[PDB]
Structure 1
């Protein structure tokens, strides 16, 4: 009756409820209303066992990494603005370097919250929201914004060093194109489907390489915004194009060592010589680092809306946006454990930190997992 008025799409949720190393929680201390409905790059971080965690509703915590008790707590709910109120609303992840919790916001601010209390020891604006977590190095806070601007904010006191537009997406798309520092150069992807290494110390282009397609005249992913953010383990830049299309290319020239222009790759990590990667089927697959040679793949994960495959307690850990943490065999794609600790779907990656597995979903904010 009332059921007959709606319309649906499809996913295949939780194959293999597994507890072979039976997961539990390390603690659960939920921050608030976290990662939200925006395109969000806010994710939990775990530092000093003083769990500097934040939501998008202002509230930034320092929980304690045994029970999640507040070592400090603040709120970035600023009391004024052109929405008449300004919460945290973080377009960047939690970057804790020094006495600064650097977080980039959709209030266009990249704060740096003092890790003893959480008070903003500096904040400096970026061009609108960020496509990027704050990347803090060389005296800079590397933000690649939604406007494509590789920005450099002074990580000690707050001062814009160089705001350099490199790769704005084709239709102002979203997705992570975070500026990674490699070989002294800020290496940026771009949801134009490209990737580029750029001399970070002024924003000077080392090279720009179009890899493959983005949205606009070749209509691709809005089911999962593909991180073109390159994981540059060594001078082969390993990255994705915005259509998921994986690439391995030179860091000083962008010359392609190999590339999967077949990539439906959502998340991707270089696990040794086996690039472990979440595809659009939400399967984990171990391609090589010198090819797309599948060292192993996964069928136990299938249409899951996964996070990135991380490692914790000897298993390949990946949560999903159905809120089910999973512990994959680090080899051929079998679960060892699976955990629903979520009150939500885990939009953010399992932060395998401090000997725990820290998480924060959109409303399933900070739990932490041991097995």
Structure 2
């Protein structure tokens, strides 16, 4: 391809000049070892009962006071196998917190449950594949969607596998975030070679299955359930709405190349593969706005916080976007190792973890 080769397609001058309409600040930051470095990861902080739990790839896990960032505990899941030199745990999926346990998945097909109290290992279970998605907890069970297309349910108390459902044999879904979603005692799992499935939580019985993509970059295929509708993103950029009750397709938009989406009220917020942001009406029918100034800056998934859509980028900036017209309302240089994993909005807090592992609490 002579023409593509002869172009210096290069360089961007992103960093739109934004006149900040408020002053976003760091309430606190706390280091977490070396973070994920240059490895791709879905590891992000979790917040519960005023405690932020965060981890790094090597195996460090910290419990921090949500108000000041002070360490409540810290343990390492890195292990030394007899005579052999200590090895990183390669934590990848999580963190997730639920009823006294911190659940984390690993690239070594390990799932760990830690006690929120003191950080001691409640249990550890060998899982059917790499756990690169966040564990999802529902009625006594820890749902793990592995990278090799398996959906396993573990007993939250002892980690024993209750059931396994082979959803597809790839491999190995390019570590797109593909956690299950829950609703009415069911799990809805996407990803999987273009199919969305709903299975019963009890014994993993297939309730319905719907092809949203023709069979065949890291797309977040986690379905989002909202008032009886399932919003699912296929790997090929198709956004689809499905009736939760029956799995019947309501509508479909061939967006071509979407990395992430969230849904909220009457809007769907999308970030495309090239870091363009867009908002659509709930039915995906009308384009409300687009924002093109962040092209190629490699954005995190967006989060809705304090009325704004917030995304971080690889250069270490946070950008705050008016959800009405997609204009920037604030821009902030936070950490120069950059952002990659999702920002988290919980109980009034905005947490985000840089690549070097430093966790920030950001106030708007």
- Fold similarity call, TM over 0.5: yes
Contact 1:26 1:356 in 2 (8 A): no
Kindly indicate whether the alpha-carbon contact (under 8 Å) linking 2:147 and 2:172 is maintained by their aligned counterparts in 1: no
Change beyond 3 A, Cα 1:349–1:17 = farther
Give the CA deviation at 1:57.
1.4
Q: Which residue of 2 aligns with 1:361?
A: 354
CA contact (8 A) 1:12 1:303 kept: no
Post-superposition CA distance 1:287-338 (Å, at most 9, x none): 1222332223223432222122222233221112222111100211111111
Give the Cα separation in 2 of the matches to 1:90 and 1:8: 36
Contact 2:145/2:178 (<8 A) preserved: yes
- Partners of 1:236 and 1:297 lie apart in 2 by 24
- Once residues 82 and 274 of structure 1 are traced to their aligned partners in structure 2, the CA distance between those partners, rounded to angstroms, is 56
- Shift in Å, 1:364: 4.5
Per the alignment, in what secondary structure is the counterpart of residue 338 of structure 1?
strand
- Separation in structure 2 between the aligned mates of residue 370 and residue 346 of structure 1, nearest angstrom: 17
**Is residue 110–residue 131 contact of structure 2 (8 Å, CA) maintained in 1?**
no
In 2, Cα distance between equivalents of 1:151 and 1:81: 30
- Return closer, same or farther for 1:333/1:169 CA change in 2, 3 Å cut-off: farther
**Aligned equivalents of 2:193, 2:4: Cα separation in 1:** 40
Q: Is the 8 A contact 2:42 2:93 kept in 1?
A: yes
- Once the two structures are superposed, what CA deviation does each residue of 1:135-194 show, in whole Å capped at 9, x if it has no partner? 011211000101111010111222111111113446654312211112322111115233
The answer to whether the 8 A contact 1:193-1:228 is kept is no
* Offset of residue 254 of structure 1: 2.6
Matched position secondary structure for 1:4: helix
Task: Verify the 8 A CA contact 1:342 1:364 in the aligned structure 2.
Answer: no
Secondary structure, counterpart of 2:174 in structure 1: coil
1:121 shift after superposition: 1.2
- 8 Å CA contact 2:129–2:150 kept in 1: the answer is no
Aligned length, in residue pairs: 362
Q: TM-score, normalised by structure 1?
A: 0.89
Aligned partners of 1:12 and 1:304 also within 8 Å: no
The reply to whether residue 352 of structure 1 matches residue 353 of structure 2 is no
The 3 A distance-change label for structure 1 pair 262 and 84 is: same
TM score, norm. by length of structure 2:
0.90
Q: Structure 1 residues 28 and 106 mapped into 2: Cα distance closer, same or farther (>3 Å)?
A: same
Q: 1:343: Cα distance to partner? A: 2.7
Gaps in structure 1 of 5+ consecutive residues: 215-223
Q: In 1, distance between residues paired with 2:48 and 2:292?
A: 34
Q: Are the equivalent residues in 2 in contact too, given 1:187–1:198 (CA < 8 A)? A: yes
CA contact (8 A) 1:194 1:211 kept: yes
CA contact (8 A) 1:140 1:155 kept: yes
Q: 8 Å contact 2:35–2:57 — kept in the other structure?
A: yes
Matched residues in 2 for 1:5 and 1:105: separation?
42
| CA spacing shift, 1:11–1:99, aligned 2, 3 Å | farther
Structure with the higher strand share, 1 or 2? 2
